[PDB]
Amino acid sequence: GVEIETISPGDGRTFPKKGQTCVVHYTGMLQNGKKFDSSRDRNKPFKFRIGKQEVIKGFEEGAAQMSLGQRAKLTCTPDVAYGATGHPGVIPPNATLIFDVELLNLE
Amino acid sequence: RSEGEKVRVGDDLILVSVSSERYLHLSTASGELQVDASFMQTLWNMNP
Amino acid sequence: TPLYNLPTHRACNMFLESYKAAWILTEDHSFEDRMIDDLSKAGEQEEEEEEVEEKKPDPLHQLVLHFSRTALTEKSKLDEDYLYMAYADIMAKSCHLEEGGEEEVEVSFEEKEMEKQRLLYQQSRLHTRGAAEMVLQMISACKGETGAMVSSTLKLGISILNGGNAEVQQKMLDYLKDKKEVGFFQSIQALMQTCSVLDLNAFERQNKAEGLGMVNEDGTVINRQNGEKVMADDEFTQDLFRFLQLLCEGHNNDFQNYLRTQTGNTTTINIIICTVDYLLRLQESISDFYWYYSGKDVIEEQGKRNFSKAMSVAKQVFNSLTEYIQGPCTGNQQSLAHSRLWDAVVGFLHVFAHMMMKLAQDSSQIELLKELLDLQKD
Amino acid sequence: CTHARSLWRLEPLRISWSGSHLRWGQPLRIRHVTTGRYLALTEDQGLVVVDACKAHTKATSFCFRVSKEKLEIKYGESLCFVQHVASGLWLTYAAPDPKALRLGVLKKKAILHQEGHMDDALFLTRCQQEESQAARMIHSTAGLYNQFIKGLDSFSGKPRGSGPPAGPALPIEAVILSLQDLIGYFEPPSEELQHEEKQSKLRSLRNRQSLFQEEGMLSLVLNCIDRLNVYTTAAHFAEYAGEEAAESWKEIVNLLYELLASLIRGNRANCALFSTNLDWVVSKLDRLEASSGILEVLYCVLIESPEVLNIIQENHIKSIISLLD
Amino acid sequence: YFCDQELQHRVESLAAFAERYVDKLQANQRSRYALLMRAFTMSAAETARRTREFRSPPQEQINMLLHFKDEADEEDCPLPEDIRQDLQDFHQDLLAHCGIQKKPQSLQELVSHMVVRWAQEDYVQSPELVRAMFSLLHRQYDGLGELLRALPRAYTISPSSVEDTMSLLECLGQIRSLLIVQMGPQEENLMIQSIGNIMNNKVFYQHPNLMRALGMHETVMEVMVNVLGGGETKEIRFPKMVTSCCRFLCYFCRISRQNQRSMFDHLSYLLENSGIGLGMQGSTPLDVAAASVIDNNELALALQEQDLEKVVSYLAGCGLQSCPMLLAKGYPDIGWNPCGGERYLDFLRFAVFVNGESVEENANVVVRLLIRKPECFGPALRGEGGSGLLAAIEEAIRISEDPARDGPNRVHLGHAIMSFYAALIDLLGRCAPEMHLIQAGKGEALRIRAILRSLVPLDDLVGIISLPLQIPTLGKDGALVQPKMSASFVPDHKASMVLFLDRVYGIENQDFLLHVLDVGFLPDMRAAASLDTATFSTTEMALALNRYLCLAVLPLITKCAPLFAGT
Amino acid sequence: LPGPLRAGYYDLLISIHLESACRSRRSMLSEYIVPLTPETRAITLFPPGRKGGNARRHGLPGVGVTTSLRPPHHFSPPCFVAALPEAPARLS
C-alpha cells in the first residue's frame, strides 16, 4: 500500500516512534505528475503529532518508516489515501498519491 | 359608491340596524320569502 | 432607585443616553450654507480651462446630477438613502436660510427687498443646478408611497419654491410638460389619498392608554413618550399642501390650469378636486371629533392640541385652495363651483358655529377659539 | 390592458371615408390586430371572431350607439353601446358561473343580446404607435412562422429523394429577412447614449420584448428551432427539404438563436419563462449550428434569472464543462 | 476607513468619560442623599429634594442631574460647579474633536479639500465614485450628527462579561455571514447551532438592550423572512429552522417589554405569514405575534383593526375548508379544519384579554369581524344546518369513539372539534364586556352581550357542562386506562364555557344556580373526590380536572356564595 | 506581469484568504460595544500625553488604542494531506 523510496539517506538510527511530534517538509504530488501540495511554498514545516490520526494513514505510516534528515518518496495508494471521495477540488477520487517527504527534525 | 357619498335613486344599498347591527336580509329559505335583520346582507333599491 | 446602587456599566449607558438627548442633540451646528457654498464654487476652473467656455459641472451640480440619475434609474420602488436624505436637508436649509432670517422694528423697503434678493440668490444656487427637476423626479419615483424620501423631497421643494419664484415655477412646468409624465401627478394624488384625518377611535384608544399606567424596561417611567396616533402625518400633509400652494403661488395661470387639466399628458388628474376631496374628508373628521366632544363642555388638553393640529392642516388646505383660485382663473373657479366645496364648507360652518358658542362659554378655550376664528377667516 | 391581445382596429365599411371620425350608427368593421380575425355574429357560437374569408357585411358590421334607446365618438367620453347593424343584438356581458368567477374567471363571455345592462357601454382608448406597430409585426411574423412550421412538418418523415418536396417551397428568404428585421428591432440601446435616453429606450425595449413574449413569439421561435434541430446537418436537412432549401438552414438556425437571445436579453420575465427550457438549452449547447448563439441564450438566461441557478444540476454543469472540453 | 476609525475613537472616549464622570456623580449623589437623611425633620423642599434624589426613576434623576446644559437652568441642578465643569470641558473637547470650533491640518480638512478639488477638476463619471466622495464630504462636514446616529449602537458592558459577549458576537457574526448564502442543510444546521448558543448565552437576558441595539432580532427576522419566502411556494422549507426562529423570537419578546414592542412593530408581517406558518408543529410566526401581544396593554390598544381582520379571515378560511396536510395524510374528509382555526382563536384570545381585563376597544372589533363572517364558527353555529354546541360536541364524541372517523395518530380530529369549539367559546366569553360597563348600562356593551347570548344559548352551555366525561377506569390486574388526554374529552374544554357562563349568562337566580350545580358541576367535584384515591391521584386526568375545578368551577361558587342563602 | 493578471491574482488572494474575515469585521464595525476596562478609562479624546494646543493637535486616525470589542480573526492553515474529516464550518 505504501512504499518508501529513499532519495537521500539520513542517519538511520533514530526513527519516530509513537508519542512525539513529527516535523516534515513534504511535497505532495499527484498520480499524474501534477503537484497538489508542498510546504516550502508556505515556508512552514508540517509539524504533526504521530499516532493522533491527523494525517492520511499512508503518510502516517511512511513517516514512521524513515529517520532524521532522510529524504524519501512516500507512495500513498488511494486505499491508504482519501480514496473513494478524494479531497473536494484538490485530489480526484481514486488516485494514487506520491510524496517527496523530508523529515527535517523532531522537536 | 363610497362612504359619505350622496344616495342617488336606483342605487343598491344595505340597511344595517343600529341596535341589532344586522343588515336587512331576504331569507328565501322557504317557498315564500321573509324580510329580517341578519348578519348577512341584501341589496335594497331605496326607490322614492 | 438612587444612582448609588446602580451598576457602573448601567450608569454609563444611562449617561450616554442622557448626554445624547440633553447635551449634544440640544447643541445645534450650522454647516449647510458653508458646505453648499463650497460645493457651488467652481474654484479656479475659469483660469485652468479658459479655452472652453462651457466647462464641467461644479461639485454641487454634479451632486444634483447624481441624485437625478438615481431618481431616473429604472426601479420597482424607491429605497432609503441617508445620503440623499441628508443632502436634501442640507440644501433645503441652505436655500431657505434667508426665508428663515438666518415689538421688533418693521422691515424697511430696502431691508425686505434685500432679504428677498438673498432668498432668490440662495434658491438660484440650487435651481440653476437642476434641483427643480430633481425634486420632480424624486416625487415621481416615490410613486405615491409616503416616507422619508417624499418628506425630504417635499421640504426641499418648499425651500426652493419659497416666495413662489417664477423661475423655479417655470422650470418645473417646463420639465413636466416636456416629459409628459403622469407619474408625478399620480404620486401626488396618491399622497393626498394616503394623508390621514382625525381618527376618533384612535383618540379614545390613546386616551385609555394614557390613563393607563405602565413600566418600561430600563428603570421605570409612568408613561413612555410616543408620537400621537391621531392626526399622524400632520407635518407631511401640511407640507404637501404648502408645496402645492407654492406651485400655484404668484397667480401663475399655467400651473393653476395644469393642476386641473393635463393637456399634454395622456392621463389627466384634477389635483384641485383631489384637494377638495381631502378637505371634505377632514371636514367630516372634525365634525365627528366635535360631536364626540359635544357632551363634555370642558375640553381636555389632548382634545385641544388635537383640534389645533387638525385646524392647522385645514388652514393649510384652505390656503392651498385660495392659491388655486386666487387669480381670476375661470377653470379653477368653475371646477370649485361644480365640486363638493360648498357641502364641505356647509359642514365647516356648522362646526364653526358650534365651536364658537361652546368655546366662548369656557374661558380656558379662548386660544382655541382665536385660532378657530383664524381658520374661519381663511 | 397592456397586452396586444386587447388591440382592435376600427375600420369603416365604406372605403372613401375609411379615414374620418366614426359616425354614430355607422356600419363599421371591427378587427383584431394581433390575430387578424374580425368580430362577427355566428348563429352557432354567438359573438366570435372569424377569418377575413368568412367575414361578411351581414356578420362583422357593428355600429356605435349613443344610448340603448331605439331611434363623432370620442376618446375620454361618449360611452358607446356597441350594437350589431344587421340585427338589433347588443354587445353584452354573459354572466359566468359563480364557481368559475370565484376560481378567478374574471373574463366574461361576449354575447349579442338585448340585455340592456347599464355597463354595456364601452370606453374607447387609442393605443400607442409603438404597440400598434408591434401588434402588426406580431401578426405578420406569426403568420409567416406558422407557415414555416407547417412547411417543415409537411416533409417531416418523408425523404424527398428524387425530386423536391411536392408541397409549396419554404418562405426561406422571407423568414431570414424577417428574423434580421426582428433582431434589428430588439437590438439593445447603445451605451454611448445619455443616461435618461438609454433608460427610456430600455423601457421601450422592455415592453416590446414583454409584448412579443406574451403573444407567444418566444414559443413560436422555440417551435421553429425544434423543427429545424431534428436534422443534424445541412445534408440531412437537404435529404428532406431539398438542396435548394438546404444552404440557408445554418443561417436560419443562427438567426433564430440570436433572435431568442435578443428577445430574452434584460427581461426577467422572459428568462424566467425559460426555467423549464434550461434543459432545452443545455441539451443543445453541443449543437455545432450556432454554438455561440445557444451559449449566448444560456448566458442571458443565467445572468437575468436567479430562479434557474436553483435548478441547475450536476449534469447541466458537466455539459457546460464539456463545452470547454 | 480612516474616518470610521476617528468616529470609533470619539465613541470610545465618550464611553471613557462616561465611566470617569459617572463615578463622580454616583459618589456625590450618595453623599448628598446621606447628608439629607442626616438632616433631621426634613421640610417640604427637603422632601422634594429627597424624592428627586431617591425613590425616583434612575433615568429621570440622571437627566435631572445632567439638565444643567443651559446657564438659565443650571440653578435647578444640585451638582457642584467643580463637578459639572468636567462635563462642560469634555463637551467642549468633543465639539473640538468633531470640528465645530492654508494647507489642511486634519483628516476632515484633507478630505474636504480633496473632494472639492477633485469635483472642481473634473466631471467624475463613475456613480460609485461620486457617491463615495460625497458621503465622505457629508461625514466630514457633520460628524457630530454621525455621532448622533452612532450612539444608539454604543453600549458599555461590564469588564467581567467580555468572554460571554465574545461568544455572542461570534455567533451573531456566523448568523450574519450565513445571510449571503442560499439556505441549505448545512447552513440551516449552523444557524440552529448559533441560535441555540445565543439562547444559552447569559448576556441574551442580562442585557436585552445590547441585543436591541445590535438588531439581532432584525437579523433573525431577515433569515425568517427569507425562509418563509421560499416556503410559501409548496411546503415550507426547513421547518426546524423556523422552529429556532420564534424559539428565539418568542423568547426575545418575553425577555423584555421594549423587546416585545420592537417585535410588535413587525406584527403585520407575522400575521400575513401565519397562513404558511400554520401546520408546522413548532413555534410559528403567529406565535411570535402572540408573544408580541401578550400582557402588554400599551401595544394591545395599539393593535389594529385590519390586523384583527387578517386573523378573522384566516379563521374563516380554516372553517370553510379542511386541512390539506390532514387530507394528504389520509384523515377522513370533513370540509372543516379545526386545528387551523384553533391557533387563530388562541391569538384572538391573547389579543383581547390582557392582565385580567378584557379590552373593550379590541373586543368590539373582534366580535364585529366575527359576526360579519359567520363562516368563522365552522359547521356549528352556522346560519342553516349549524345544529348547536350540544349536537356538535356530542357528535364529536361519537367521531372520536370509532376508528372509522378518528383513524386516517399525531392529531385526532375528534379532539380537534372539541378543542376548536372550546377555544371559540373561550374567545366569545373572553370578548364579553365588563361588569362595570354592564352596570353603567353602556349600549354597545349590552348589544355585545345580546349578540353573544344570541350566538350561544344557556342550554348548550349547561348540557355540555353536564355531558358525561369518561374517567380513568381500573380494569383487570390493576391495569387502569387513563384517558388519552389529547384524543378524548378533557375538562379544559368545559372550563372555557364555564368562563363564558360566568361572564355572560352569569348566575342571577338561585334556582338556576342549583340547576347548573347538579348538572355538570357536582358530578365533576364528586368525580374529582373519587379521583383523589392514591392510585388515581397522580393521574393526568386528575391533574387536569383539579386545574379545571380550581380555576373555573370553584371561583364561580365563591362569587355566588351570597345567593346560596335560603337553600 | 500583465495588468489584468496582476489584478486577478491580487483579488484572488483577497478572495481566498481575506474576504470572509474582512466581511465579518465590517459587519462588526457598525456596533460599538465598549468594555468597562482600565484601558477604556485611559482612552482619552485628545492626546493625553500632549497638553494645551499640543493636545488640541489631533492624533492620527487609528494609532490610539481601541478597546471596543471585535471578535478575533480565526484562520485555519491550508493542509490537504490531513486525515479526512455536521462538520464544523471551515475557516478561511
List the grid coordinates of C55: 466647462
Q: What is the largest CA-CA distance in chain F?
A: 63
A to F contact (≥3 Cβ pairs closer than 8 Å):
yes
Q: Retrieve residue E145's grid coordinates.
A: 450628527
Q: Which residues of E touch F91 (CB under 8 A)?
A: none
| CB atoms inside a 10 Å sphere around CB E140 | 24
- What is the radius of gyration, based on Cα positions, of chain B? 12
Contact C19, E168 (CB under 8 A): no
List A2's β-bridge partners, or say none: A76
DSSP string, C130-178: THHHHHHHHHHHHTT--SHHHHHHHHHHHHHHTT--HHHHHHHHHHHHH
In 3D, which of A92, B14, C204 has the Cα closest to residue E442?
Answer: C204
Q: How many CB atoms lie within 10 A of CB E189?
A: 16
> Are E157 and C21 an interchain contact pair (Cβ–Cβ within 8 Å)?
no
Residue-number span of the structural domain to which A55 is assigned = 1-107
CA E49, chain centre distance (Å): 39
In units of Å, what resolution does this entry have? 3.4
Residue A81: phi and psi, rounded to 5, are -105, -170
Portion 173-232 of D in contact with C at CB < 8 A: 195-196, 199, 202-203
Chain E, window 107-136: residues with a beta carbon less than 8 angstroms from a chain F beta carbon: 107
Q: Write the CA distances from E564 to C123, D149, E245, E514, E560, integer angstroms.
A: 85, 94, 53, 9, 7
Alpha-carbon E426 to chain mean position: 20
Chain F residues whose CB is inside 8 A of the E193 CB are none
Nearest to E68 by CA among E85, E53, E55, E52: E85
Farthest CA pair distance, chain B? 37
- Record: contact C205-E302, CB cut-off 8 A: yes
d(CA E292, CA E250) in angstroms, rounded, equals: 8
Residue A55: its chain F contacts at CB < 8 A?
Answer: 81-83
Q: Could you tell me if residue D242 is left (phi over 0), alpha (psi between -120 and 50 degrees) or otherwise beta?
A: left
Residues 2-61 of F with CB under 8 A from E: 20, 23-24, 27-37, 40-46, 56, 58-59, 61
Looking at the partner chain, which of F41, F62, F89 has a beta carbon nearest the beta carbon of E19? Answer: F41
Nearest CB neighbour to B29, from listed E374, E384, E451: E384
What is the amino acid identity at position E174?
A: Q
In this structure, the number of other CB atoms found within 10 A of the CB of residue E356 comes to 6
Breaks (C–N over 2.5 Å) after residues, chain C: 102
- Residue A23's beta-bridge partner residues? A47, A105
User: Taking CB atoms and an 8 Å limit, are E25 and C29 in contact across chains?
Assistant: no
Contacts of F78 (CB under 8 A, 6+ apart): A42
Residue ranges in C73-108 assigned as alpha helix (H): 82-100
Cell of C13: 449607558
Cα of C163 to nearest chain D Cα, Å: 31
Element (DSSP H or E) covering residue C260: helix C253-260
- In degrees, rounded to 5, the angle at the alpha carbon of residue E244 between the alpha carbons of residues E240 and E246 is 120
Alpha carbon distance E555, E502 (integer Å): 10
A4 is catalytic: no
Alpha helices by DSSP H, chain D: 98-103, 129-154, 172-185, 195-215, 217-228, 234-241, 243-246, 249-264, 268-273, 278-282, 291-304, 307-310, 314-324
Q: Is A99 helix (H, G, I), strand (E, B) or coil?
A: strand
Of the listed A4, A46, A98, A99, which one is catalytic?
Answer: A99
Cβ pairs E/F, distance under 8 A: 115
With touching defined as 3+ CB pairs under 8 A, do chains A and C touch? Answer: no
For residue A9, give how far its alpha carbon lies from the nearest alpha carbon of chain F (Å): 24
CB atoms closer than 10 angstroms to residue A6: 12
Q: Which residue of B has its CA nearest to E443?
A: B19
Q: Measured between CA atoms, how close is C209 to chain E, in angstroms?
A: 6
Q: Which residues contact E498 (CB under 8 A, 6 or more apart)?
A: E465, E552, E553, E556
Q: Domain count of chain A?
A: 1
Identify whether A41 is a catalytic site residue. Answer: no
Picking from A58, A84, A86, A64, the residue whose alpha carbon sits closest to that of residue A2 is A58
Cell of E254: 418575553
Q: Which one-letter DSSP state was computed for residue A85? A: S
- The neighbouring-strand residues paired with D91 are D112
Please list, in sequence order, all residues whose beta carbon lies within 8 angstroms of the beta carbon of residue E105, skipping any fewer than 6 positions away: none
Q: Which residues contact C213 (CB under 8 A, 6 or more apart)?
A: C222, C223
Contact C209, E302 (CB under 8 A): yes
**Residue F17 DSSP one-character state:** I
State the cell numbers at E36: 439629607
Kindly list the residues from chain F whose CB atom is less than 8 angstroms away from the CB atom of residue E6.
61
Q: What is the CATH number of the domain that holds A26?
A: 3.10.50.40
SS3 D90: strand
Tell me if A49 sits within 8 A of A23, measured CB to CB.
Answer: no
CB D245 within 8 A of CB D238: yes
Angle between helices C330-338 and C271-293 (to 10 degrees): 40
Question: ∠F25-F29-F32 over CA atoms, to 5°?
Answer: 130
φ, ψ at B16 (rounded to 5°): -95, 140
Query: Chains E vs B: touching, with 3+ CB pairs under 8 Å?
Result: yes
A 10 A CB-CB count for E277 gives 28
Q: Where do the H-state alpha helices sit in D33-78?
A: none
Residue E478: Cβ within 10 Å count: 7
Give backbone dihedrals phi and psi of E39, rounded to 5 degrees, phi first.
-60, 110
Angle value at C-alpha C9, between C6 and C12, nearest 5 degrees: 90
Cβ–Cβ contact F80 with A under 8 A: yes
Give the closest residue to E28 by CA, choosing from C3, C1, C22.
C3
Helix (H) or strand (E) holding D91: strand D91-94
Name residues 282-321 of chain C within 8 A of E (Cβ): none
Of A56, A91, A98, A100, the catalytic one is A56
Chain position carrying cell 404607435: D129
Q: Cell numbers 408546522 correspond to what residue?
A: E280
For D198, nearest residue in chain C (alpha carbons): C73
Residue E433 exposure: Cα atoms within 13 Å on the Cβ side? 22
Closest Cβ–Cβ partner in E371, E374, E447 for B19: E447
**Phi, psi (degrees; rounded to nearest 5) at E377:** -85, 0
CA–CA dist A84, D190 (Å, integer): 53
**DSSP H helices in D216-313:** 217-228, 234-241, 243-246, 249-264, 268-273, 278-282, 291-304, 307-310
Q: Residue B5's CB: how many other CB atoms inside 10 A?
A: 9
Residue A26 appears among annotated catalytic residues: yes
Residue A7 a catalytic site member:
no
- Alpha helices by DSSP H, listed for E353-490, are 360-372, 389-401, 403-406, 413-431, 435-440, 443-455, 458-465
Catalytic residue check, A56: yes
| Contact by Cβ (8 Å): F82, A87 | no
- Cα within 13 Å of Cα(E479), Cβ side: 3
**C-alpha closest to that of A43 among A89, A93, A104, A97:** A104
Integer Cα distance of D271 and C191 in angstroms: 35
DSSP β-bridge partners for residue B23: B16, B38
Supply φ then ψ for residue D35, to 5 degrees: -90, -15
| D97 φ/ψ angles, rounded to the nearest 5 degrees | -70, 145
Whether D30 contacts D62, CB under 8 Å: yes
* Cell reading at D317: 454543469
Pairing assessment for the beta strands D8-12 and D28-32 based on DSSP bridges? antiparallel
Burial code (b: 16+ CB inside 10 Å, e: under 16) for E198-233 equals beebebbeebbbbbbbbbbbebbbebbeebbeebee
